[PDB]
Amino acid sequence: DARQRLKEVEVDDNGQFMTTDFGGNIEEQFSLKAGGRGSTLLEDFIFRQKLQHFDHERIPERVVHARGAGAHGIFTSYGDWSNITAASFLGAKDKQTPVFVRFSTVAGSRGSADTARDVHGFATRFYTDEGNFDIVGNNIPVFFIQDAIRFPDLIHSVKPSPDNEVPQAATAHDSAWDFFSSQPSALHTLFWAMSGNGIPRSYRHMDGFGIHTFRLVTEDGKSKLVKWHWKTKQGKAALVWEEAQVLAGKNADFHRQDLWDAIESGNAPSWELAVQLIDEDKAQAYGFDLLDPTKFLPEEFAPLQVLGEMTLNRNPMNYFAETEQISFQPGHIVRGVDFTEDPLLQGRLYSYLDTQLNRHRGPNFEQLPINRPVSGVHNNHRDGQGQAWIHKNIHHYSPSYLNKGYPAQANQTVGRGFFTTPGRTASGVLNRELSATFDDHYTQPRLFFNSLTPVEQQFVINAIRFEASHVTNEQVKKNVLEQLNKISNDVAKRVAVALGLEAPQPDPTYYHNNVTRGVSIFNESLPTIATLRVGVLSTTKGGSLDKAKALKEQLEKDGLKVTVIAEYLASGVDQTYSAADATAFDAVVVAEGAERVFSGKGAMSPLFPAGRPSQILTDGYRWGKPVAAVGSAKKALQSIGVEEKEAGVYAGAQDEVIKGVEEGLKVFKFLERFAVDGD
Amino acid sequence: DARQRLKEVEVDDNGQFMTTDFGGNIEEQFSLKAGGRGSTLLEDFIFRQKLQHFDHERIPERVVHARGAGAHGIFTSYGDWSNITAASFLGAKDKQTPVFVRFSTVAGSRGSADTARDVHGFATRFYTDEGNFDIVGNNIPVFFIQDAIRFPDLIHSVKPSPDNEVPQAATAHDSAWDFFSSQPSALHTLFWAMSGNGIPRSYRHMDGFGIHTFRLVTEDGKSKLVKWHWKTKQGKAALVWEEAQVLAGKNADFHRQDLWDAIESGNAPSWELAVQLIDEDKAQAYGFDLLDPTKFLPEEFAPLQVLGEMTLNRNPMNYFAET
Amino acid sequence: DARQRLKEVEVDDNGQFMTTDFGGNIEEQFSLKAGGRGSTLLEDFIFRQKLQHFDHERIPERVVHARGAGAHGIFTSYGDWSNITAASFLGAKDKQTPVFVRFSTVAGSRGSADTARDVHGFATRFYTDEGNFDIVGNNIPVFFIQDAIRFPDLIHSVKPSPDNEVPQAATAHDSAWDFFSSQPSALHTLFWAMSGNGIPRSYRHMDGFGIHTFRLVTEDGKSKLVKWHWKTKQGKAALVWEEAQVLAGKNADFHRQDLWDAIESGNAPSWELAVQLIDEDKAQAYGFDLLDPTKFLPEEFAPLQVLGEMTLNRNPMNYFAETEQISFQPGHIVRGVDFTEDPLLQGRLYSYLDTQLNRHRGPNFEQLPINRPVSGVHNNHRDGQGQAWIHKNIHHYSPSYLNKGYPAQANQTVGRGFFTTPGRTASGVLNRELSATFDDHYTQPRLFFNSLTPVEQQFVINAIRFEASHVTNEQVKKNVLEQLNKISNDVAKRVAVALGLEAQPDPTYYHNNVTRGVSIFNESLPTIATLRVGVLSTTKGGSLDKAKALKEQLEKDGLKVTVIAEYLASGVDQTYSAADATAFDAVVVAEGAERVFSGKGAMSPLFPAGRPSQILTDGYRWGKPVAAVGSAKKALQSIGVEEKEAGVYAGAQDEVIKGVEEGLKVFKFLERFAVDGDDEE
Ligand code: HEM
Ligand code: HEM
Ligand code: HEM
Ligand SMILES: [O]
């Protein structure tokens, strides 16, 4: 149980009498009044203690990544990695460390939809026996900007316009694309966010990245440069944009509910922790500067080396107390890890400590149960708002004869203390500059686009076409085109058509044809289909529901979550047509006999919106899902112009449809149904 | 200009050099570093004052009605209403008073969709020459509960489940319908929320209500019981649910944008402020108790009297500072 | 151990390496620098997490009573008092309840002197098994004002002038006496604050009062009006003003050190809890309205009935986490107690809950270890800043099918819930007035003055004389005279002399009635344990050996003895440079030490000129028992004190010890203070 240490703060109210927050049993369903129909009395202490706590329930949302959700789990080290790091949680084979992970979007506020297009947070806390260690990462290996002093500019430009606070959770407006084109460093992360990484199927189907180069340091101070990677054991999977848009309205909680259900049903998601390791003398060996967070290291130059596996298997008990209150910091570092002179990382260390003072309005937020380390806290800090401990040592200072030297200093040689890498040097003038080594903003965007499949590439261009079409200012649109033309002339040409703008002339300076592995989503089928969702469209008339139940029980044997849909909640029905939408499922199959709700009288009913069964099948087909029909239900496929000939379309008897749908879920998205420019 | 008094706090940055918050011109696109590829210095005061302000930008959202938008306008009285109220802003024909109005949903958080099904808030401030007078109303004339001590119970039950914070901005989950069925007073507002009032076409196409019976008092202390009504001059209009759902994803800002567009286009929306007036000795004469906020007074028993008109004709300049 | 429940939050750093607040061993004595003499690096996470916690150490002081100190203890009931109250902590003989008590002044900020002249706070929390019950009282039984809405006006007027923030911790300025004269209800508390109650010898030598009439209610709902009293088992004792003033400079921590020392030495102070009980139908039957907080109920009309005893026997471990952070509320009420329509108490209920939001900057302050009840919290409250728990019940609302009805409602008959007194009614028009029964502002101030001894009365007149002479505005001073004249023409006449104003009788409220239990100096102390004796000695000759034997015998009687000399020779507790008469309750010159009172021994680089003579002079002039052993008689002579004066003891060691211990019971010798008319020719 990853949540074991949280047991002692849990409050059980079963069988208990209602109390105030200072004890004493009460009733609190009636205000105290002066006469039968009289005014409420100030002396009603019960009312005011209850309402005061309600009145003050909210705390400020995170300044970025406000929308998110998380879970507890366990990290297991695969080996004794003392040859590369002194870090205790990586110090022995099969060593286990509790974790908590919070996934998120970036731009939207607390209540915005999970399926907005956005970068995604992927933040992990290791509660190691030598302190909390956070990898505060994203699902994309590069960031928009090269210096942390520019983060407010990026965020302001992406978040809603400050006059009317429009639009919510979206980069599709003038200020964002004005920034993207005025600060060309942003073009790499933008391309990733315009790819499938911007609309992932779930948190469980994301890879994760620390982005920055850090340092791993051994006991003797020798260091290696390192990139952190999380490799999902579920495989990477993405939606298509037209599907994410509807899903945002039909279920804004799609991702947080997906993670909750996977854990609750015993299908805990897993990620392997992997590293790229680079010697210090190769920091600038690979065509870019590893201090530059707008570049990633191609795995051709440094393969991913697996160090262990993380499994998330415990949901929180109270979302606010745990998920909302947890306070991540890249400065949560432990012995055996160090920073690098990455100018974006450098400013993060300041920003995350400082921002907790706003979100928690006090300096004692690390005493909150979800923030507490398991290893013990011994220092001379005292007081502060909400001080929750009582310190014995009255000589709260160092050095001191009266406390006998305790708490005592720890460094590299004694007490397993943290230490900065011994060899790191400073040299040169104090400057407000960036190294000329950072100046290439176009090569790696071109490399990323090169390494996607043709329809994957078309998804990127259609995202850009959609987004830039919302930009009202003509010059900004031409600025965007001028910058895309430096990445690829064909990309600029294809986007220019949607904007009604001329195809610009080639600017070949940064063009190249190289490819790299591990960045594509749609070029690989899923390693498992467990937890994927099948909507079975049925009907309460005839014998369709009995067949739908048999279909359901077989699909569940493969670990799928199957929803039987009909006009009303008859026996065996999981959802009504009125509440159903194709966005909820990874495959749609029509049960035999249910073709009666796709035309005529069965399609016109007061119990669901007109055309709803046909709309679900149409949606599922057009969004690239496996779609199927059993027996006579093939007529439902005919009614929407779909043929069994097609990839990802299955008809025939039950066992044939089951095998086909299950194969199709491995493919997940059938890109044959998406037109490519000049195909 | 309804916003006339706010111009002295307006700050124009066109044509100026970047400064810190304590003055002095600066550049702030590069951190100070110790060497060409070096670490950032703690003595970069420019960096820290810039990032500290960004780090501290957010304030807690409203505990309810967190999702909303507003605008400025003018209220004009149609008459000298001194025979029923001493209220200064109603004391003369054609008297004008600045207003600000915020419209909202109730359950959803700051970034939830405008076209969620919900009660809608309709909060009006009159900046009168005798103090601020707020009518903090909804687009539905009745409320769920009969005693304010039960508000945390109602709100907890409708807002997302506290274990996983699901579902956003929605009554369609177990705890809400548990409460509606366990606290039967809730059924009136429920029915209103399940009608077109729950999914309006826009803020301009809603009516508004103070809900509670209040009192109008004259100079010499004579009182009448009063119900406040806002009657939209744009007409009431609503969507259908299957459309509001898609709209929640296609444009979460639909109502926000619609209000902004109408004002900027010169199509300012208006409402008439109207009252039902009841003698004190009739507080219990109409088949219910006028102190009970789960009931409305049918207009057959007391028709509306029109006091004046409000027009919303100026959008805010900074959403945060104003709305 | 009354602190037992707090042991789970205590942190032991002995034998440990230094860490950050998120774990990980560290060193934090050098900033991380870019080169040997380089600038400090922003990536020094150790520096910033260290200094951030330092930079955010302070919280707002209390808006009033900012200055004070407290301790843990035990309350023991003397009986089963369910015949008068359903309160659990009073439900069985020898039933014990943990307490915390904080004493305080009122006007001064956090770092002002203990021995300022002021009303004093006396706040007790009972951690009962049916919730926290607080009695938030003062060492004076009456308050300045009759309606809580006037509290900011009173407090603004006695706190420093808002232009220069002058004066600190004092009523002796224009605005305060402008308010006392403009709002005559304040005159009663003013007289108490001008008496010994304003300058008590220690927290342990104060009585305590709930002030308000409350209600005790039995299980069946029958009620009685009640006044709470704390009666100190150490006796009431007070300083004189000219001594309190010097003490404010020589030791601003005099009272909090007193309490800490008494508890550490095993002399835990005690108070008895006593009540006055009044029938509901007699609320207005004793010459005033018992809803009026400017009145007290004379003990001749209703005697004190002891319910139990409280003993304070454990100091805090961390002052900030316990004493500074504790949040008292008169709304901290339990089953068996109820409020009254006293308009001052009424507004207090709102104000103490509200002010916690400012001091603790969040609504979860009852989760702080010092504020937590011992009885258990079960409700549907959630979230809030700094939420320290993780609630299991996901159906956080009532009523509810899904949560099976839990947590469940408790009332009078089910679950031992709180209930308002059943017979209480409201009748009449909603009003912004006060009952005309509150109108008399002068009778009880006169009753209080009438009940003090002649020198005690002179202390009151001399305090007013001192204070009003600071008022620059002439009309304010005359306004003060006119109001004083309504209490007593003689009092007004004697104050007028100091102010140079003219002395006519206004007899509407004059009377000669007296009542018991309001004087301090008319009764000697029941014990001299913990009282302090300064033994003045010297390092030359045999004086020190004699002073040690003197100290030994005095300590056998429970006295705290300080032997003083030129330097810290063996057996010396304090140097003359560091000593002052304010620190002691009696001053004894050891034999041989007369050499430091004149000639060569009195002029030394090791202490200020004349310091031993000044300590003895201060001690005598301030009414203390003073003594000299053997030849040290000459020291008394050098300051003009005669051996046979009251409270002056000369002779051999044995008679001096006996005389000093007897004089400590008297405590202050009031024949040394002139009374108006004494100097007449
Ligand atoms: C490689 C670049 C970055 C990555 C991978 C990243 C990732 C993240 C993630 C995952 C979170 C959400 C943590 C959670 O779930 O609670 C977050 C929040 C935050 N980020 Fe970043 N971020 C980056 C850049 C920056 C920069 C440059 C700044 C400012 C200099 C910044 C300031 C913040 C702040 C203030 C928060 C809110 C933290 C809180 O309120 O607890 N981020 N970031
Ligand atoms: C007739 C019944 C009610 C109506 C018409 C109503 C209306 C509103 C409206 C329109 C707002 C948002 C105003 C804005 O745009 O900022 C609001 C917010 C709020 N309401 Fe109500 N409400 C009702 C019942 C209650 C009750 C019973 C309580 C608690 C006792 C309550 C507590 C609050 C609070 C605390 C806020 C947050 C206000 C702020 O943060 O500024 N409401 N209400
Ligand atoms: C009989 C009248 C009163 C008595 C006996 C009394 C007593 C006390 C005491 C002893 C304290 C300090 C408790 C501690 O040591 O922490 C205190 C604080 C305080 N008092 Fe009163 N007081 C009275 C009148 C009032 C009134 C009328 C108000 C306002 C309506 C008021 C407002 C406050 C506030 C706001 C605090 C600060 C509490 C905190 O910060 O925790 N008091 N009072
Ligand atoms: O971030």
Residue C533 phi/psi, 5-degree rounding, is -120, 125
A527 CA → ligand 3 middle, Å: 67
Structure tokens that stand for B178 in this block: 């548990």
Structure-determination approach: X-ray
DSSP annotation of A219 reads T
Identify whether the C-beta of residue A449 lies closer than 8 Å to the C-beta of residue A191: yes
User: DSSP strand E in C395-538: where?
Assistant: 532-536
Q: Radius of gyration over alpha carbons of chain B, in Å?
A: 24
From chain A, pick out residues whose CB is under 8 angstroms from the CB of B29.
147, 149-150, 153
Of 2.20.25.240, 1.20.1370.20, 1.20.1540.10, 3.40.50.920, the CATH number of A431-528 is: 1.20.1370.20
Residue B82 phi/psi, 5-degree rounding, is -65, -15
* Side chain identity at residue C205, one-letter code: H
Please identify which residue in the block is written with the tokens 């196409």. Answer: B205
The gap between the terminal CA atoms of chain C, to the nearest Å, is 63
User: Does A319 contact B162 at a Cβ distance shorter than 8 Å?
Assistant: yes
User: Does A409 contact C382 at a Cβ distance shorter than 8 Å?
Assistant: no
Instruction: Name the residue among C568, C567, C611, C605 with its Cα closest to residue C587.
Output: C611
Cα–Cα dist C205/C124, whole Å = 16
Residue B246 sits at the chain A interface (C-beta within 8 Å): yes
Which of C42, C54, C406 minimises the CB distance to A13?
C406
Our answer to whether residue B251 is catalytic in this structure is: no
From the number of C-beta atoms within 10 Å of its C-beta (0-12, 13-18, 19+), residue C299 rates as middle
Cα–Cα dist C401/C445, whole Å = 60
DSSP annotation of C40 reads B
Pocket test for ligand 1, best of A150, A352, A356, A359 (most atoms within 8 A of CB): A352
Cα–Cα dist C454/C494, whole Å = 13
Which superfamily does CATH assign the domain made up of B1-323 to?
A: Catalase core domain (2.40.180.10)
Per the rule left: phi > 0, alpha: psi between -120 and 50, beta: everything else, C642 is: beta
Identify whether the C-beta of residue C14 lies closer than 8 Å to the C-beta of residue A406: yes
CATH number 3.30.70.890 given to A529-679: no
Q: At A154, which helix (H) or strand (E)?
A: helix A151-158
User: Does C25 contact A415 at a Cβ distance shorter than 8 Å?
Assistant: yes
Cα–Cα dist C148/C64, whole Å = 14
Our CA dihedral for B109, B111, B117, B123, rounded to 10 degrees, sits at 70
State the smallest CA–CA distance between residue A397 and chain C in angstroms. 11
Instruction: Name the residue among C193, C180, C186, C69 with its Cα closest to residue C119.
Output: C193
Residue A325 sits at the chain B interface (C-beta within 8 Å): no
Q: How far is CA B73 from CA A659, B4, B70, B93, B309, in A?
A: 64, 11, 10, 18, 11
CATH number 1.20.1370.20 given to C431-527: yes
Crossing angle of the two packed helices C241-250 and C611-621, in degrees rounded to 10:
140
Cα–Cα dist C300/C271, whole Å = 21
Cα–Cα dist C86/A284, whole Å = 80
Q: Which of B26, B43, B49, B51 to mutate to test the interface with A (most CBs of A within 10 A)?
A: B51
Structure tokens that stand for A441 in this block: 């903003």
User: Does A398 contact C42 at a Cβ distance shorter than 8 Å?
Assistant: no
Q: Å resolution of this model? A: 2.2
Residue C509 assigned ligand-binding role = no
3-state secondary structure of A250: helix
Which atom of ligand 1 lies nearest, measured to the CA of A211?
1
From chain A, pick out residues whose CB is under 8 angstroms from the CB of C404.
14
Our answer to whether residue C65 is catalytic in this structure is: yes
Per the rule left: phi > 0, alpha: psi between -120 and 50, beta: everything else, C183 is: beta
Identify whether the C-beta of residue C85 lies closer than 8 Å to the C-beta of residue C336: yes
Cα–Cα dist A239/A196, whole Å = 7
Our CA dihedral for A526, A528, A531, A537, rounded to 10 degrees, sits at 70
The residue whose CA has the least distance to atom 13 of ligand 2 is: B123
Helices (H), A201-342: 241-250, 254-264, 319
Q: Which of B14, B25, B56, B65 is catalytic?
A: B65
Identify whether the C-beta of residue C139 lies closer than 8 Å to the C-beta of residue C198: no
- Other C-beta atoms lying within 10 Å of the C-beta of residue A427: 11
CA atoms within 13 A on the CB side of C16: 20
Q: Which residues pair with B278 in a beta bridge?
A: B225
Identify whether the C-beta of residue C528 lies closer than 8 Å to the C-beta of residue C558: yes
Instruction: Name the residue among A166, A593, C349 with its Cα closest to residue B252.
Output: A166
The residue whose CA has the least distance to atom 35 of ligand 2 is: A55
DSSP annotation of B83 reads T
User: Does A60 contact B60 at a Cβ distance shorter than 8 Å?
Assistant: yes
- Other C-beta atoms lying within 10 Å of the C-beta of residue C464: 23
User: Does C382 contact B156 at a Cβ distance shorter than 8 Å?
Assistant: yes
- Distance, CA of A410 to chain centre: 37
Helices (H), C173-332: 174-182, 187-193, 241-250, 254-264, 319
Identify whether the C-beta of residue A149 lies closer than 8 Å to the C-beta of residue B28: yes
From chain B, pick out residues whose CB is under 8 angstroms from the CB of A151.
51, 54
From chain A, pick out residues whose CB is under 8 angstroms from the CB of B47.
148-149, 347, 350
* Side chain identity at residue C9, one-letter code: V
Identify whether the C-beta of residue A551 lies closer than 8 Å to the C-beta of residue A654: yes
Cα–Cα dist B161/B178, whole Å = 12
DSSP annotation of A18 reads P
Q: Going by C-beta distance under 8 Å and a sequence separation of 6 or more, which residues neighbour residue C557?
A: C528, C529, C661
Which of C39, C44, C399 minimises the CB distance to B34?
C39
* Side chain identity at residue C330, one-letter code: P
In CATH, the architecture of A1-430 is Beta Barrel (2.40)
User: DSSP strand E in C453-556: where?
Assistant: 532-536
State the smallest CA–CA distance between residue A16 and chain B in angstroms. 17
Q: Going by C-beta distance under 8 Å and a sequence separation of 6 or more, which residues neighbour residue C491?
A: C449, C460, C461, C464, C484, C485
CATH 3.40.50.880 domain position(s) in chain C: 528-681
User: Does B183 contact C394 at a Cβ distance shorter than 8 Å?
Assistant: no
Q: Going by C-beta distance under 8 Å and a sequence separation of 6 or more, which residues neighbour residue A143?
A: A189, A211, A293, A294, A344
Which bound ligand lies closest to the C-alpha atom of A65? 1
State the smallest CA–CA distance between residue B216 and chain C in angstroms. 17
Cα–Cα dist A156/C651, whole Å = 88
From chain B, pick out residues whose CB is under 8 angstroms from the CB of C51.
none
Residue A29 sits at the chain B interface (C-beta within 8 Å): yes
Residue B50 phi/psi, 5-degree rounding, is -70, -45
Residue A357 sits at the chain C interface (C-beta within 8 Å): yes
DSSP annotation of C33 reads B
Helices (H), A123-264: 151-158, 174-182, 187-194, 241-250, 254-264
The residue whose CA has the least distance to atom 29 of ligand 3 is: C348
Which of A150, A163, A437 minimises the CB distance to B29?
A150
Please identify which residue in the block is written with the tokens 């084109």. Answer: A181
B136 CA → ligand 2 middle, Å: 7
State the smallest CA–CA distance between residue A392 and chain B in angstroms. 33
- Against chain C, the chains showing at least 3 CB pairs within 8 Å are A, B
Identify whether the C-beta of residue C109 lies closer than 8 Å to the C-beta of residue C67: yes
CATH 2.40.180.10 domain position(s) in chain A: 1-430
Cα–Cα dist C312/C123, whole Å = 13
Identify whether the C-beta of residue C272 lies closer than 8 Å to the C-beta of residue C228: no
CA atoms within 13 A on the CB side of A192: 27
User: C528-681: what fold?
Assistant: Rossmann fold (3.40.50)
What count of residues does chain C have? 681
